[PDB]
Amino acid sequence: SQRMLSFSDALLSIIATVMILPVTHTEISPEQQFDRSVQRLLATRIAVYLMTFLIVTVAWAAHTRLFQVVGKTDDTLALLNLACMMTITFLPYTFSLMVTFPDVPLGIFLFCVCVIAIGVVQALIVGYAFHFPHLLSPQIQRSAHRALYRRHVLGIVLQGPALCFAAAIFSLFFVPLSYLLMVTVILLPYVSKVPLSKERVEAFSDGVYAIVATLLILDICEDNVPDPKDVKESGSLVAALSATGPRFLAYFGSFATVGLLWFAHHSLFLHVRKATRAMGLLNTLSLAFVGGLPLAYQQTSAELERVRVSCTIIFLASIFQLAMWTTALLHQAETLQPSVWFGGREHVLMFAKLALYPCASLLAFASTCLLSRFSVGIFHLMQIAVPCAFLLLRLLVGLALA
Amino acid sequence: SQRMLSFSDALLSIIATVMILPVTHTEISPEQQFDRSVQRLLATRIAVYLMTFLIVTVAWAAHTRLFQVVGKTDDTLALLNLACMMTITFLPYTFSLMVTFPDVPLGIFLFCVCVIAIGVVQALIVGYAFHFPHLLSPQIQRSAHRALYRRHVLGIVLQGPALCFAAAIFSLFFVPLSYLLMVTVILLPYVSKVPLSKERVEAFSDGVYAIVATLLILDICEDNVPDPKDVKESGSLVAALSATGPRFLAYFGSFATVGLLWFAHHSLFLHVRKATRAMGLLNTLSLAFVGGLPLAYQQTSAELERVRVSCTIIFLASIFQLAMWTTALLHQAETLQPSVWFGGREHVLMFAKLALYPCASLLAFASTCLLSRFSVGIFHLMQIAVPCAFLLLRLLVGLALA
C-alpha cells in the first residue's frame, strides 16, 4: 500500500535533481578567455537548478500530502499515480523553457499546462477515492465524517491549476508581467491558511543524496575511460589514466562529503519521531544545497577564491541540517526522542555530529586569515576521519567537564 | 537500523544502471554511412552494460546477504558501509577499463584491486560485528550459537577477493588468459555449495525502474530546451519545439512501458511473501532488460527491424517477470499468498497482469505476418489502456466460463 509511494519519491528525487546535470557538465575549464559569459551562464544554470528543485519539491510535497488522505490504494489508483508522476516529470523541462523564453507566452502556457495536468490527475485521484470511501480513505476520520473533506481537498489540490490558468490566460490575451500568479501557486500552501510524513521525507532525502553522491561518477565512467587512442597522445595506460586524476579526486571528495552529510542527516532522522513543518521546509533547502555540492568539489579539485565558494556551499548544505535539528527548542517533546533532548543521553553527540560540517566550513572559510589556501584537503580528511573516532571524543569532554 | 540499507540499494540501483547512459547517448542518427561500425559499437556498449549490471547486482546481493547477518547497526558500521559503497561504486569504471584494455594487465589489476577493496571492507564489517556480538549480530540466529559463523562468513565474503587476487597475479607474472578466475568469483556463490530479502529486492527494483523510466527525460531537459538561437534556423518556438517531437514521443512511450512493467512487478511482489533464490535470479535479468528498454523505444520512435528489436526487448523484460511469477509451481505455499495461488481469488488477474506484456510483444512480433509494421503505436496505446479496465475484463471471462 506504500511501495508505490516509495517508487514515487524515488522517481521525484531524480526529477528534482535532474537540473544539477547542466551545472556539473558546463565547461569547467576556462581555457578560452571568456570567463564572464561562462560565469553568467553558470549562475543562470544554478538559479534554474534551485528553482526547479524547489518547484519539484513543492509538487512532491503536494503529491505526498494528497496520498496522506488516501490510505489504501487500488490498481486504478496506481495507474493514476503513474499518470500523475509522468505529468510532474515534465516540470523541469517546461520550467527551463519558460525561463529561457520569458516574453514568449508559449513557455508560460506550456508550464501551466504542465501544472494543471498534474492538478487534474490529482483531482481525479480524489474524485475516485471519495467515490469509493469505505475502502480507500485513510482511517475512521477521513472516511467517517461529514465528508466535506471532499470539497476541502478538492479546493486545496485544484487551486494551483486554477490559479495559474489565470496566468496562462494573462500571458497572451493581456500583458504578461503577471509572473506572480505562479509564485502564489507556489506560496499559497504556505501562507494562505495562516506536516510531511517522516518516512516520505526520509525517502526523498535518501534519493537526492544517492543521486548527488554518485553524480560525479555517473560521468567519470561514461566520458573518462581512456579510449585506445592514447597511443597517439606512447602507450602507458597508467599515464593516460593519471590525467583524469583531478576528476577522481573530485569524485572521492564529493562522495565522502555527501556520505558524511547523509550520515548526519540519517542520525538526525533516526531520532526525530514526528517531523514538523519547519523541519521539512529546512530539509528541502538542505537538499537543494547538497545537490549543489558536487559543483563545489569539482571546482575546488580543478586557488583560494574557489575554495571560498566550496566552503560556503558545504556550510549552507550543513547549516540547514543544523537549523532543522535546532528547530526543537519548543518541540523537543513532540518531535525528538528522549535520547537526544536537552541534557539527553546522546544530545552532545547529535549536536556535534550535526555541527561538525558547518564548524569545519567556518574553520576553512577562516583560511582568509592566512595564506595556506589548500588547507581544505587536510580539513576534509579530518572531517571524514572524525565520526569514526568521534563517539569517544565526546565522552572525553563530557567526563572532563567535571 | 534499515535506512542505511535503503540508501545503499538506492545508490546501487544507480551504480548498476550507470552503464545504460552510453547506450542511450550513442549517435542514434545514421546520418553518415558508417552504420556497421556504429552497430558494433552499440553492441559493445550493450554487452558492457549487461555485464556491468550483472556484476554490480552480484556485489549488491553480496552486500545485502552480508547485512542479513548483522541485524543492528552502529555509527561505525554506517561509516564502514559508506566506505564499502564508495568502493563498489567503482566497479563499472574499472570493468569498462578492463574490457576496453583486455591484454593490458593494468585493467585487470585495477578491477581486482576494486573488488578486493570491497571484500576487505566487508571483512572489516564482519570483524567489527563479531567483535561486538552482544548487540550487532542479528535477531538471534548468529548471536547465540557456536560462533564459527565467524569463519564461515569470513570465507564466504573473503573468497572473492582472494580468488581474483590470483587473477591479478596471473595477469602480469604469467599468461593472462585466466579470465575465468573472475568468472568463478562471480559464479561461486551460485554453484560452489550445491535467499534475498523481499524488501531489499523491492528497493533495488524500484530504484532501477525509476532510473530507466526517467532515463529519457534526464537528457530531454538538458539537451533539448531550444536555445534562443532558433531565430537563425524565423522565430516560432512552436516550430522549434516540434522538431524535438520524436524525442518526446520516445520518452512518453518509454515511461508508459516502464511504468506498466513496474506496476506488474509491484503487483507481483505485493503477493510474493518470501522470495526464493530463483525469483531473485530472474528478477535481476528482468531488471537488466528493463534497463535496456529505453534504447528500444528511442530506436523505434526515430522500420520493421527497429520495431522487431523493440518488441524483442519488451518481450525479454516481461518474460523474465512472467517466469519469476510462474516459478511458484512447487512453492506457491511457501512464497505466494493464498489470494494468488492456483485457483485463487485473483490468480487469473495476476497471470493476466504479468502476461499482458509478453503476449503483446508476441502479437507485435507477429507483425511479420503482414506489412503494417506501424501497428506498435496502437498496440502500446492498447497496452497502457488495458490495465485500467482489465480487472473488469477478466471478471467477464471468469463469469462466462460457466
From Swiss-Prot, chains A, B:
Residues with site note (Hydrophobic filter residue 1-2): 211
Effect of residue 326 to W: Abolished interaction with LAMP1 and subsequent inhibition
Motif (RxxxFSD motif 1): 3-9
Stated consequence of mutating residue 215 to A: Does not affect selectivity
Membrane-crossing residue ranges in chain numbering: 2-24, 46-68, 75-96, 107-128, 153-173, 179-194, 198-222, 248-270, 277-298, 307-327, 348-371, 374-400
GO biological process, one term: phagosome-lysosome fusion
Quaternary structure and interacting proteins, as annotated: Homodimer. Interacts with AKT (AKT1, AKT2 or AKT3); leading to formation of the lysoK(GF) complex, which activates the channel. Interacts with LAMP1; inhibiting the proton channel activity of TMEM175. Interacts with LAMP2; inhibiting the proton channel activity of TMEM175.
Membership in a protein family: Belongs to the TMEM175 family.
Protein's UniProt name: Endosomal/lysosomal proton channel TMEM175
Origin species: Homo sapiens (Human)
